[PDB]
Amino acid sequence: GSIKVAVVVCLLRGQNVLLGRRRLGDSTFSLPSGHLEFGESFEECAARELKEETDLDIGKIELLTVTNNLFSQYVAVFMRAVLADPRQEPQNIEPEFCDGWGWYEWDNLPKPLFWPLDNVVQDGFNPFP
C-alpha cells in the first residue's frame, strides 16, 4: 500500500463554506481536495486545486489541522482560505469529478459527507475563525 498526501480546503465567505458533490466517495459532499504535487507548498496546492475545480482564486491560506485516513492511506492537510475577490462564484469546470458547488453553513452541512470529512466533523473540527 501507498501513503499519499492530500490538501483539503475550507474556502470561507462570511459564515459559509464551499462544498461540492463528488463524482472514491461517489455522490457524497466534500471539500475541494487533491493530491500534493512534488515541489508544492500546502498553499500552492490549495490554490491550484480550487483553480482547477472551480476557477476560483483564493488567498490568505492558513493551516488548520491534519488527519490520517486509511482505505491506500491519505494524510489530509486541512487549510482555510478566502476568495481573493469575494464577488466571484464557483464554476463547475470538472464535471467528470463533481456535480456542482454550493455555499453552506457549518451549522447545517449537507449529507451524506465523504467519510473522511464526516470523521473530522464528528471530532469537532470547525474552520471558521
Ligand SMILES: CC(C)=CCC/C(C)=C/COP(=O)(O)OP(=O)(O)O
Ligand atoms: C477531508 C478529506 C476529503 C480527507 C480525505 C483526503 C482524500 C482521500 C482526498 C482524495 O483526493 P481526490 O479528490 O483527488 O480523490 P482521489 O483520491 O480518488 O483521486
